[PDB]
Design a protein around this ligand. Structure first.
Ligand SMILES: O=c1ccn([C@@H]2O[C@H](COP(=O)(O)OP(=O)(O)OP(=O)(O)O)[C@@H](O)[C@H]2O)c(=O)[nH]1
Lengths: 300, 146, 123, 139
């Protein structure tokens, strides 16, 4: 019948969907493994960047104290199906809502998510085609656009995803204060006994010219952005596997349910057709009447 | 089944599976000698350097023509595709036999070399509005000719 | 009770082996912990050890068939699960009956390897 | 994996529901009460059956001579109809119930689980697995 064929076609479509999603899983795992090589080569580029910018600070004074623009550069993926990374980044941004907040998100999903939720705190976003390797030029472009968005900005907060392991993708932050505040903190560390761990570093920077210091600042900011985007890409690939596995499980459940419905429907259809035919036959038989028998009844 | 939505990898199993699928296309039944010889040639990798589009033309030249005789290079004594009575010798003696294996390989190697040198080279250099149509018609005709 | 315990242990190990096969197919073999590697090795030995040559196929396969006693199978699998036979090569369990057959095949494989190595050193 | 109080007790309850033969009313209700009041929080999930077997059949308090209850002992099957009469929360059977449960939990955690957590030998692992199999099939 038609309903039986309807379920058959639906099951075939689900099978095609499952095959396509499995191919997507294989492709994503290929890049996960292919760009898994970063793990061996990471965690050593940013060593003096820590001294430049690593500071244990409260989450309130740094926010309320500033009265100039607070730039935020959330990292977001171009394609969906990554998982909860973008949602968590949006939640983190929402928790830090302020009149000084300015957004220059990254990725199509980030743009489409921050444009509607935050129309008056959104200027424009950056997009990279995932064709080449995440390189320094991309980070420089992001930094230049961030400066042009708000040059008199108190800080530039980069929010990205740190890929701790195949199944752990936390949210990490890089804070990049303004040149003036960084200079003040550097001078305080160099002179005062406080910040004893940066004393040598600050004094070394002071001895040099100012152009070199500015170049150092820009260079290490770009390195931090490069690290953020790389970790976000790796987390996206991994995070993407979880979503693809979830989609595969959902598709398998749908296939099982449709197959059960198909079997049940075909059995019911066969039974109904047979019952209808037998009912017609019984109706025909009932109308038949046995006439008088013309036989020699006495001859017995 | 694992490369529907991604660029395929041209490994030996695929390079020969494509030709095998291409060879199964036919309109009329094939004589045993022709079919078995073509399958053997595709099985040993003699069609690795032949494009999937020209497989039918290659098979037609192998069956209904003889490149070695055309260019005066054939050295085989008896194993020629125009000797239709070799079918029963092949049936009695498998292609993987010393009686026929040597000359079979020699003929296949020579035919592949001559084809790649003369025909496919010109095919890849077709740049015109009428030559392209002529080549397309030739390929379609060879598709249903063998 | 021993039969039931051994059977349940074998089933559990096979299920865990399927899970670990999926994991390595996703991540890789080197990502498995020390316990997982041992589980994989034991499960592969079990899978190879469940095969058996039948006496009915002696004419065709050309190798003598084996008739394994019930208690022999229980003891062999119990020993394998614990880890007593962790030194025997994996292929020693392929198409054999009992535990004695495994030992004999392992000895023959070792002798063949030693002879081949000795011949190689000569040339 | 955040394990709150409801999750721990739920897991222990699911473990206790594993049965083969019908359980006497006193044993089942006593085990359920012990699990509900958090006496199995420190007990691992895989040792719940062994803990229940010790509580029902054996008696740690009597074994180590640290028993203080006057009448409330699991070997006194006659207490089933006294528990059924008022409750397990009655002032008559509540103090001794809590005392024996606390003593049993303390002795178990001190003696049995501590040793079970220090088993590495392959033979001892097999022995522990056999013990758990036997307990799961008998209370
Ligand atoms: O007028 C000036 C004074 C100083 N400087 C710059 O200030 C820095 C003082 O640097 P130092 O005086 O502490 O070190 P140095 O002798 O090893 O200098 P280099 O060879 O490494 O450069 C040097 O980098 C110097 O070039 C100027 O560029 N212009």
């Amino acid at each position: 019948s038609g309903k039986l064929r309807l379920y058959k076609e639906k099951l075939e479509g689900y099978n095609r969907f499952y095959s396509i999603v499995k191919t997507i899983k294989m492709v994503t795992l290929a890049k996960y493994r292919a760009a898994q090589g970063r793990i061996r080569t990471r965690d050593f580029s940013l060593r003096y960047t820590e001294l430049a910018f690593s500071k244990p600070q409260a989450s309130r004074d740094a926010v309320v104290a500033a009265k100039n623009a607070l730039v935020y550069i959330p990292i977001t993926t171009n394609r969906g199906s990554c998982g909860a990374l973008n949602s968590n980044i949006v939640r983190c941004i929402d928790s830090v809502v302020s009149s000084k907040m300015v957004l220059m998100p990254v990725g199509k999903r980030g743009i489409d998510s921050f444009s509607k939720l935050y129309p008056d705190e959104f200027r424009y976003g950056i997009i990279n085609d995932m064709k080449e390797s995440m390189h320094f030029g991309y980070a420089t472009f992001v930094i230049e656009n961030a400066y042009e968005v708000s040059k008199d900005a108190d800080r530039y907060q980069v929010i990205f995803n740190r890929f701790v392991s195949a199944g752990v993708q936390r949210n990490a932050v890089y804070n990049i204060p303004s040149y003036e505040k960084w200079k003040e903190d550097l001078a305080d560390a160099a002179s005062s006994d406080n910040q004893k761990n940066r004393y040598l570093f600050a004094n070394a920077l002071q001895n040099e010219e100012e152009q070199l210091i500015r170049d150092f600042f820009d260079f290490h900011a770009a390195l931090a952005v490069l690290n953020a985007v790389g970790e976000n890409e790796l987390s996206e690939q991994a995070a993407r596997l979880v979503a693809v596995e979830g989609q595969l499980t959902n598709i398998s459940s749908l296939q099982q349910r449709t197959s059960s419905l198909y079997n049940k429907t075909r059995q019911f259809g066969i039974t109904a057709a047979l019952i209808e035919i037998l009912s017609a036959m019984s109706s025909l038989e009932g109308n038949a009447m046995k006439g008088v028998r013309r036989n020699k009844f006495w001859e017995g | 089944a694992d490369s529907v939505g991604g660029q395929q990898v041209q490994t030996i199993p695929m390079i020969r599976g494509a030709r095998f699928v291409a060879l199964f296309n036919q309109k009329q039944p094939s004589y045993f000698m022709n079919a078995i010889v073509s399958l053997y040639a595709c099985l040993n990798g003699y069609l690795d350097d032949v494009k999937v589009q020209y497989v039918k033309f290659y098979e037609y030249l192998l069956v209904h023509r003889d490149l070695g005789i055309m260019y005066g290079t054939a050295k085989n004594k008896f194993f020629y595709m125009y000797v239709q009575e070799l079918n029963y010798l092949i049936r009695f003696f498998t292609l993987n036999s010393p009686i026929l294996h040597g000359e079979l390989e020699e003929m296949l190697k020579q035919h592949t070399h001559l084809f790649l040198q003369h025909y496919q080279s010109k095919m890849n250099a077709i740049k015109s509005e009428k030559d392209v149509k002529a080549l397309k018609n030739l390929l379609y005709s060879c598709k249903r000719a063998v | 009770v021993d039969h039931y315990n051994v059977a349940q242990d074998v089933v559990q190990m096979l299920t865990k082996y399927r899970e670990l096969q999926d994991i390595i197919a996703v991540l890789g073999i080197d990502e498995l912990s020390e316990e997982d590697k041992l589980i994989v090795d034991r499960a592969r030995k079990l899978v190879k050890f469940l095969s058996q040559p039948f006496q009915v196929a002696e004419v065709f396969t050309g190798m003598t068939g084996h008739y394994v006693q019930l208690d022999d199978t229980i003891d062999s699998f119990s020993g394998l699960l614990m880890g007593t036979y962790d030194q025997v090569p994996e292929m020693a369990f392929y198409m054999v009956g009992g535990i004695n057959s495994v030992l004999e095949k392992a000895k023959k494989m070792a002798e063949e390897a030693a002879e081949l190595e000795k011949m190689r050193r000569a040339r």
